[PDB]
Design an enzyme around this catalytic site. Structure first.
Site, PDB file in Angstrom:
ATOM      1  CE1 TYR B  12      -3.441   2.722   0.144  1.00  0.00           C
ATOM      2  CE2 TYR B  12      -2.996   2.947   2.491  1.00  0.00           C
ATOM      3  CZ  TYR B  12      -3.646   3.374   1.345  1.00  0.00           C
ATOM      4  OH  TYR B  12      -4.512   4.450   1.403  1.00  0.00           O
ATOM      5  CG  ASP B  32       5.861  -6.910  -2.548  1.00  0.00           C
ATOM      6  OD1 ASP B  32       5.194  -7.936  -2.268  1.00  0.00           O
ATOM      7  OD2 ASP B  32       5.624  -5.798  -2.030  1.00  0.00           O
ATOM      8  CG  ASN B  33       6.382 -12.100  -0.258  1.00  0.00           C
ATOM      9  OD1 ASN B  33       5.589 -11.145  -0.240  1.00  0.00           O
ATOM     10  ND2 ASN B  33       6.534 -12.931   0.782  1.00  0.00           N
ATOM     11  CG  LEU B  34       3.967 -10.148  -6.038  1.00  0.00           C
ATOM     12  CD1 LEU B  34       3.683 -10.657  -7.452  1.00  0.00           C
ATOM     13  CD2 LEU B  34       3.693  -8.649  -5.944  1.00  0.00           C
ATOM     14  CB  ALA B  80       9.130  -6.022   2.972  1.00  0.00           C
ATOM     15  CB  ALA B  81       6.737  -5.216   7.873  1.00  0.00           C
ATOM     16  CE1 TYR B 147       3.909  -3.874  12.489  1.00  0.00           C
ATOM     17  CE2 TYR B 147       2.874  -2.296  13.951  1.00  0.00           C
ATOM     18  CZ  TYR B 147       3.482  -2.597  12.752  1.00  0.00           C
ATOM     19  OH  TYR B 147       3.668  -1.606  11.822  1.00  0.00           O
TER      20      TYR B 147
HETATM   21  N1  LIG Z   1      -0.458   0.796   7.217  1.00  0.00           N
HETATM   22  C1  LIG Z   1      -0.268   1.508   8.450  1.00  0.00           C
HETATM   23  O1  LIG Z   1      -1.221   2.006   9.029  1.00  0.00           O
HETATM   24  C2  LIG Z   1       1.123   1.609   9.011  1.00  0.00           C
HETATM   25  C3  LIG Z   1       1.389   2.349  10.144  1.00  0.00           C
HETATM   26  C4  LIG Z   1       2.667   2.415  10.644  1.00  0.00           C
HETATM   27  C5  LIG Z   1       3.704   1.729  10.012  1.00  0.00           C
HETATM   28  N2  LIG Z   1       3.429   0.996   8.873  1.00  0.00           N
HETATM   29  C6  LIG Z   1       4.549   0.225   8.146  1.00  0.00           C
HETATM   30  O2  LIG Z   1       4.754   0.587   6.724  1.00  0.00           O
HETATM   31  C7  LIG Z   1       5.156  -0.586   6.069  1.00  0.00           C
HETATM   32  C8  LIG Z   1       4.222  -0.866   4.896  1.00  0.00           C
HETATM   33  O3  LIG Z   1       2.893  -0.724   5.314  1.00  0.00           O
HETATM   34  P1  LIG Z   1       1.695  -1.166   4.350  1.00  0.00           P
HETATM   35  O4  LIG Z   1       0.394  -0.676   4.921  1.00  0.00           O
HETATM   36  O5  LIG Z   1       1.928  -0.573   2.982  1.00  0.00           O
HETATM   37  O6  LIG Z   1       1.656  -2.735   4.347  1.00  0.00           O
HETATM   38  P2  LIG Z   1       1.455  -3.661   3.067  1.00  0.00           P
HETATM   39  O7  LIG Z   1       1.050  -5.019   3.573  1.00  0.00           O
HETATM   40  O8  LIG Z   1       0.386  -3.085   2.171  1.00  0.00           O
HETATM   41  O9  LIG Z   1       2.816  -3.766   2.288  1.00  0.00           O
HETATM   42  C9  LIG Z   1       3.829  -4.623   2.749  1.00  0.00           C
HETATM   43  C10 LIG Z   1       4.486  -5.248   1.582  1.00  0.00           C
HETATM   44  O10 LIG Z   1       5.566  -6.058   1.913  1.00  0.00           O
HETATM   45  C11 LIG Z   1       5.419  -7.297   1.218  1.00  0.00           C
HETATM   46  N3  LIG Z   1       6.084  -8.342   1.981  1.00  0.00           N
HETATM   47  C12 LIG Z   1       5.736  -8.783   3.209  1.00  0.00           C
HETATM   48  N4  LIG Z   1       6.583  -9.742   3.599  1.00  0.00           N
HETATM   49  C13 LIG Z   1       7.496  -9.945   2.631  1.00  0.00           C
HETATM   50  C14 LIG Z   1       8.604 -10.795   2.475  1.00  0.00           C
HETATM   51  N5  LIG Z   1       8.971 -11.754   3.502  1.00  0.00           N
HETATM   52  N6  LIG Z   1       9.333 -10.723   1.346  1.00  0.00           N
HETATM   53  C15 LIG Z   1       9.033  -9.869   0.340  1.00  0.00           C
HETATM   54  N7  LIG Z   1       7.968  -9.025   0.446  1.00  0.00           N
HETATM   55  C16 LIG Z   1       7.197  -9.047   1.572  1.00  0.00           C
HETATM   56  C17 LIG Z   1       3.968  -7.573   1.038  1.00  0.00           C
HETATM   57  O11 LIG Z   1       3.713  -8.435   0.016  1.00  0.00           O
HETATM   58  C18 LIG Z   1       3.493  -6.127   0.768  1.00  0.00           C
HETATM   59  O12 LIG Z   1       3.323  -5.741  -0.639  1.00  0.00           O
HETATM   60  C19 LIG Z   1       5.249  -1.730   7.073  1.00  0.00           C
HETATM   61  O13 LIG Z   1       6.548  -1.936   7.495  1.00  0.00           O
HETATM   62  C20 LIG Z   1       4.459  -1.318   8.245  1.00  0.00           C
HETATM   63  O14 LIG Z   1       4.940  -1.836   9.428  1.00  0.00           O
HETATM   64  C21 LIG Z   1       2.152   0.919   8.372  1.00  0.00           C
END
Ligand SMILES: NC(=O)c1ccc[n+]([C@@H]2O[C@H](COP(=O)([O-])OP(=O)(O)OC[C@H]3O[C@@H](n4cnc5c(N)ncnc54)[C@H](O)[C@@H]3O)[C@@H](O)[C@H]2O)c1
Ligand SMILES: NC(=O)c1ccc[n+]([C@@H]2O[C@H](COP(=O)([O-])OP(=O)(O)OC[C@H]3O[C@@H](n4cnc5c(N)ncnc54)[C@H](O)[C@@H]3O)[C@@H](O)[C@H]2O)c1
Lengths: 329, 329
Positions: B12, B32-34, B80-81, B147
């Protein structure tokens, strides 16, 4: 008896713990990549009782998972780690990888394969620089180097694992230096911390280190010198057995392992000299600012809750052990 | 231009950050691993400007290394997380493995292959349950769920990496909830905390939840309801570009990202209803135990130290973004 995996069983504390486990009715397995461990210690104990030895690296996560799926352990006693503070300051990622990362996969694997008793060798380094002379398990966990942090992180994973999975029991053991441990980064430190006093004394007695310095002889202690916490390898070894025994009917817990008192710099010098016959060079120096006069584990909890009873709380034996092992290092 | 890797770039925030980076002169790559991210958003951007895409899982350490040894990145922005507090409570090892462990290998790999700029997406969850209404970068780091702990652990590895490797610079961003984020697992949570209110509101407007609660309307706030911190996906995305810019001429740092004020429960609800035209059920209940009236980021540090400037601090635009993306989850 129960099936136990001892990781790091070819190493110093692991092999001694292995020897003690072999005299029990438990089914014993050992895992070690022989990076510091010695195969010869393993072979020598296999000519006592039989035990499976798995020459495997914890960084091969699939290999670990598969070993655990096949063997179905009841317990693990986890010694495998990198253990040198000085090295961790220079190479933190090695410590986070070999300690925290490998341990994390190990825990996930325990959970997936029903290994529900986990004994973890942590460290007093998790306390960092304690603000009391006699440190209890409740003291703040404030490590000041990557080694200490890498161990505390694994403790925290164990805590979260147990909270999410009530069936999964962990017992964490923290302790100070164990006499006779071979460390590659100590001899190159000219003025090591007093927590390494026995190692330094042993190094001097073995002709490896030229002089031993006493930093301060006017502290508010018995003989005016610093008091620190040391333990015999067979006594820390037995406490791991006691920790496993404790998890039979009891919930998860953390214990300091120690004699409940320390030894002074002066005592260790006298004992090391007497036991080795080497009158090595020692010199009086001023106090080193920042050094506490006393730093030891509070061991009342482990005495209270378990059957652990040390039997080598004897400075001459401890120094003799350190001396003998030193010459092997 | 500089060669930049965006891990999690199909996700996102990562995809919105990628879109902004493609406007710069940088050579951009995405990993990204999708597992959750969409290749759809990726292809429809790989039309606009050409960028290298690597469908690689961070859990494959050797593959990550091969890739990094080949590509020789100048920088990484690491999104990525796994991101769900509620899921981390039930499955902590998933979070320590996918976050802390994968990030740890990533950091070692960066050090081994010369990636000396590391921008890390952390979280306000590192603050835990703060004693103050407003939280600055110096607030105590005391996460209360796996987390938050998994992310804090990675911040600590980064700190140690830069200490032992002065050439390695990191910048860590902490922020609260990002409007529009998918959190599929938490939809199964009956009462998420107020920090997730904009998401709960979106879900109600989309007909995915039948009802939304207001817990207490008698707080010492403008309208009596809780005040929390929300941010537009494009505003957190630009903050990540700013962070990388900041590292050109400055040393490692950590910043909160935020508007410097919050939004009330009531305001979010009314905006969500306006934007969506859905008059979903809102039920007023007593104060919920443990709920602070106010919890937001102090963002004065990042304003003062970087070029970052919010572009979409507007409750309507934030709720519209949340609603639009909700239907895409
Ligand atoms: N969304 C929120 O409200 C928020 C708030 C604070 C911090 N964050 C941080 O921002 C970052 C991204 O947030 P997001 O909302 O876009 O999450 P997201 O899930 O939409 O994106 C994470 C991406 O990482 C990829 N991924 C996960 N594990 C993987 C792996 N082992 N190898 C390769 N790819 C991998 C997923 O496929 C995904 O496209 C994260 O680290 C999260 O902790 C998010
Ligand atoms: N004074 C001390 O020695 C002391 C003090 C406090 C805590 N501890 C802890 O006790 C434990 C053991 O201490 P030790 O003195 O016996 O050290 P040690 O080096 O002798 O034992 C470690 C063993 O684990 C093995 N090992 C390391 N990494 C491995 C891997 N990735 N895969 C498989 N095997 C691996 C080594 O080969 C070795 O045989 C460690 O966890 C350490 O942190 C030791």
């Amino acid at each position: 008896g129960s099936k136990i995996l001892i990781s790091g069983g070819a190493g110093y504390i692991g092999s001694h713990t292995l020897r003690q486990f072999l005299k029990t009715d438990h089914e014993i397995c050992v895992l070690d990549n022989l990076s510091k461990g010695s195969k010869i210690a393993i072979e020598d104990l296999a000519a006592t009782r039989a035990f499976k030895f798995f020459e495997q690296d914890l960084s091969d996560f699939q290999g670990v998972k598969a070993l655990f799926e096949r063997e179905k352990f009841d317990a693990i006693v986890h010694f495998a780690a990198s253990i040198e503070v000085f090295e961790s300051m220079q190479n933190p990622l090695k410590y986070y990888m070999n300690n925290t990362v490998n341990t994390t996969n190990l825990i996930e694997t325990c959970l997936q394969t029903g290994v529900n008793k986990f004994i973890f060798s942590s460290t007093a380094a998790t306390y960092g620089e304690p603000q009391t002379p006699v440190v209890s398990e409740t003291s703040p966990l404030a490590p000041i180097n990557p080694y200490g942090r890498s161990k505390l992180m694994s403790e925290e994973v164990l805590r979260d694992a147990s909270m999410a999975n009530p069936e999964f029991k962990h017992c964490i053991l923290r302790y100070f230096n164990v006499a006779g441990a071979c460390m590659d980064y100590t001899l190159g430190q000219r003025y090591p911390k007093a927590t390494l006093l026995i190692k330094v004394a042993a190094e001097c007695a073995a002709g490896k280190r030229d002089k031993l310095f006493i930093f301060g002889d006017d502290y508010d202690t018995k003989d005016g010198t610093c008091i620190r916490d040391f333990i015999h390898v067979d006594d820390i070894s037995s406490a791991h057995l006691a920790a496993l025994d404790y998890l039979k009917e009891n919930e998860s817990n953390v214990f300091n392992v120690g004699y409940g008192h320390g030894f002074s710099v002066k005592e260790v010098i006298e004992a090391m000299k007497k036991v080795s016959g080497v009158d090595f060079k020692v010199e009086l120096a001023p106090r080193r600012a920042g050094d506490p006069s006393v730093l030891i584990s509070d061991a009342s909890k482990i005495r209270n809750l378990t059957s652990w009873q040390p039997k080598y709380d004897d400075l001459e034996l401890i120094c003799k052990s350190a001396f003998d092992w030193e010459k092997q290092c």
